[PDB]
Structures are given as structure tokens and as C-alpha cells.
Design a protein around this ligand. Sequence first.
Ligand SMILES: Nc1nc2c(ncn2[C@@H]2O[C@H](COP(=O)(O)OP(=O)(O)NP(=O)(O)O)[C@@H](O)[C@H]2O)c(=O)[nH]1
Ligand SMILES: [Mg+2]
Length: 178
Amino acid sequence: GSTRFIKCVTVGDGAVGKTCMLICYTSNKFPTDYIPTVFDNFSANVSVDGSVVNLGLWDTAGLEDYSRLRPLSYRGADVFILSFSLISRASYENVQKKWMPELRRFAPGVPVVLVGTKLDLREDRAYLADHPASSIITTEQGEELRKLIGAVAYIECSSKTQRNIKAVFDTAIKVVLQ
Ligand SMILES: Nc1nc2c(ncn2[C@@H]2O[C@H](COP(=O)(O)OP(=O)(O)NP(=O)(O)O)[C@@H](O)[C@H]2O)c(=O)[nH]1
Ligand SMILES: [Mg+2]
């Protein structure tokens, strides 16, 4: 009758973990193989701050070949999740250079939740030992990116260890409702 339906579109570079995060959100576990390029999702009656909502999750591919389809998905969106990987400075720079400009262009004033993915790798000593320090985005650098591009919230998460997965989508709801 009145339950709000929220269209939330997740975007960001190839291989940052957008699909794993959508899958992890409903299944509460890390999908370790057979990951499709896109897996749309939904959760019903999600209660955030006592308010109940249907959250529709549109997955999008980061692939360059699908760049003309993406704006078709942006149409009618209530909120975007804009993802980059915490162990990829390149993905972080693409947020500034590629993703935020496109969202601003096709969907001005739609709130953006910035999300840094793969938090487990940022905290993994072998991973850190074997990659340049400059590749790694620290929380202060993510929060700065949030202000710089004008996103409304910033969440760091790991699908692999289930850190802050629920917070990503609870934040997506809050930003639409508050
Ligand atoms: N260590 C770690 N790996 C992750 C995490 N999430 C995703 N991955 C790994 O990251 C790779 C890409 O994940 P995927 O969800 O397919 O990324 P995507 O952003 O949907 N890629 P596309 O843009 O091509 O659809 C996979 O190898 C996957 O296991 C995470 O939290 N931690
Ligand atoms: Mg995907």
C-alpha cells in the first residue's frame, strides 16, 4: 500500500567486488566461485531505524563494453553505491575521473554511498608485503575521497570476511529516508 521501494544501483570499476557484495548481503557468506558478472538482488521489509522498506539492487558490470548500457540503469534510481577497491589506487582515481562525473551527468542530486571494498586485503600482511604501499587506500584517504566527490556516506567492507556488509545497504536506505 505504502511500503517504499528503493532502486539502488551499484557501480564502480571491473573486479572491485560489486557482485560479491550484493550476493553476500542476502546470503551472509562469501561466494568463492561461479561469480556471474551481474547478480541483481532484493531484500524485503528491511528495517532501518524502525522504518521498513523494499530495497531493489541493480548490479552493473564495470566492463568498458557495457558503458552505454549503464546510463539506462541509472534512470529512475534512488541511490547509488559507488565502489572502488581499497587495494587499488587506480579504482580510487576512477571514482573521481570516471564514475562520479557520469552519475552527476545522468542522475544529478541522487545520493551516492561511496564504498571501499576488499577491506580484508588492506589488513592482510602478505598482501601488503607484496604490493606497493601506494596502491593501498587508508580510511583517511577514503573519507577524503567521500568529501571531494560529494558522496553522502562512506563505508569500508569485506565480502570475504563479512565486515560492514549490512552497513553498506543500511546506509543506502538511510540516505534515502533521512
Ligand atoms: N579478498 C577479497 N576478494 C574479493 C572481495 N569481494 C570480491 N572479491 C574478489 O574480487 C573479484 C571480483 O569480484 P566481483 O564481485 O566479481 O567484482 P565485480 O565488481 O562484480 N566485477 P564486474 O565489474 O566485472 O562485474 C573476485 O576474484 C572475488 O573473489 C573481498 O571482500 N575480499
Ligand atoms: Mg559483477
